[PDB]
Each structure stands twice: as C-alpha cells, then as structure tokens.
Amino acid sequence: AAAAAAAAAAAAAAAAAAAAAAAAAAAAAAAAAAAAAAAAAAAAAAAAAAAAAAAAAAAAAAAAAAAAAAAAAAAAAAAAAAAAAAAAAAAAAAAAAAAAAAAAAAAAAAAAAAAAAAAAAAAAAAAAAAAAA
RNA sequence: UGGUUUCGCCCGAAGCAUCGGAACAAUGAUCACCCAUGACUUCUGUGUAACACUAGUGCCACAAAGGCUUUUGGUGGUCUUAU
Numbered sequence: 001a002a003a004a005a006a007a008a009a010a011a012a013a014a015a016a017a018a019a020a021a022a023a024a025a026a027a028a029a030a031a032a033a034a035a036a037a038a039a040a041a042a043a044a045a046a047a048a049a050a051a052a053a054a055a056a057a058a059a060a061a062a063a064a065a066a067a068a069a070a071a072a073a074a075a076a077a078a079a080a081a082a083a084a085a086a087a088a089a090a091a092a093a094a095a096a097a098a099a100a101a102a103a104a105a106a107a108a109a110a111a112a113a114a115a116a117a118a119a120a121a122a123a124a125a126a127a128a129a130a131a132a133a
Numbered sequence: 134u135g136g137u138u139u140c141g142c143c144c145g146a147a148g149c150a151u152c153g154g155a156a157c158a159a160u161g162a163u164c165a166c167c168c169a170u171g172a173c174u175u176c177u178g179u180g181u182a183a184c185a186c187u188a189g190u191g192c193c194a195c196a197a198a199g200g201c202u203u204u205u206g207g208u209g210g211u212c213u214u215a216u
Binding site: 003079 | 182
C-alpha cells in the first residue's frame with residue numbers, strides 16, 4: 001500500500017513502526033520507516049526530532065540507522081549555516097553509523113565539507129567513534 | 134625677609150588633531166570556496182512507482198554527483214591602493 005503511495009501520517013508512522021514481533025522484523029520496520037521517512041524523516045518540525053530519535057532507537061541498529069541515513073540523503077534536508085551546524089550531530093552504534101556519518105560528510109563534502117570552525121573536528125571525532133576513520 | 138607680578142631660556146604630564154606613515158582592521162575589489170542553486174541534462178547513481186515476466190524491469194525522478202550558464206551571500210584569503 002505504501003508503494004501505492006497511501007498517506008502514512010507522522011503519528012501513524014510512530015505507532016506503525018512501533019512493532020515488537022517475530023524475528024527478522026526490526027530491519028523490515030527499518031526499511032518501511034525509511035521509505036516513509038525519506039520524505040521528511042519525522043522532522044516536519046525540529047522538536048519532531050524527539051519522535052524521530054525514538055524512531056531511530058526503535059530501529060535499534062546501526063544498519064537501520066544507515067538506511068535512514070541514505071533516506072535523509074534522498075530527503076535532501078534544508079541547507080542553512082546554523083542548520084547544518086546543528087544537523088551534524090551523530091553518535092550511535094559503530095557498525096553502519098560509520099557509513100552514515102561518512103555519507104553525511106560526503107554529501108556535504110561534494111562541495112564545502114562541514115567546517116563550522118568546530119564541526120570539522122567534530123565530524124572527524126564522531127566518524128572515528130562510529131568507525132569512520 | 135619672603136611675597137607679588139613680568140620677561141628670557143632649559144626641561145615636556147595629560148592633551149589638541151595634522152601629519153608622518155606604514156602597517157594592522159574594515160569595506161571595496163581578485164580567484165576560488167563555508168556550498169547550494171537558479172538552470173537538467175549525457176549517463177551515473179539511486180530510492181521508487183508500474184507493470185508482465187523472469188524470477189523484476191523501460192520509465193519514475195530525487196539527488197549523491199560531475200560539470201555546466203553562471204550568480205551568490207559570504208567564505209577565505211586574496212589584492213593595490215581607495216578610504
């Protein structure tokens with residue numbers, strides 16, 4: 001149905017992906033939520049980031065968070081100075097958050113990598129912490 | 134005896150801005166960059182829909198991206214002197 005592109009509201013997405021079920025379902029919920037979120041990533045606000053963070057912790061995987069990472073890329077969030085200064089925050093499991101932070105530095109680095117006078121060293125440190133260095 | 138007042142020189146606290154001037158600091162200007170973007174395309178790549186067919190794909194269509202008319206606010210330093 002979602003591939004037929006039917007509306008999945010924000011709270012709808014939270015309640016939907018809120019699925020503790022049989023095995024091998026966390027990554028399925030992850031790809032579903034990444035399909036639904038690649039539009040806006042549960043970020044129609046900036047305090048919707050708490051909802052999205054419970055969503056990331058429910059995806060409970062570095063690989064799931066990386067699916068959401070490429071989804072954020074396919075989302076192409078806004079670009080303001082302070083926007084990226086506050087949107088370069090990353091700290092998670094070091095198995096595909098590696099790919100996530102590296103791909104974020106890559107998308108921003110195709111032109112003018114993050115160099116907010118702190119955010120560059122911050123991206124380096126968070127990358128090494130997520131195993132992206 | 135000290136005083137007063139006056140003049141001449143010697144020193145020159147704060148200060149007057151002039152200049153002196155060169156050399157920092159801030160805009161103008163140079164070429165490229167914190168970096169998307171206005172452009173859209175060749176595929177290239179990439180997450181997705183629609184639809185017959187092989188066990189999944191020409192189109193769908195943002196975007197991760199190179200490279201484009203460029204501009205652009207400012208970035209970063211860049212200029213030379215203009216102030």
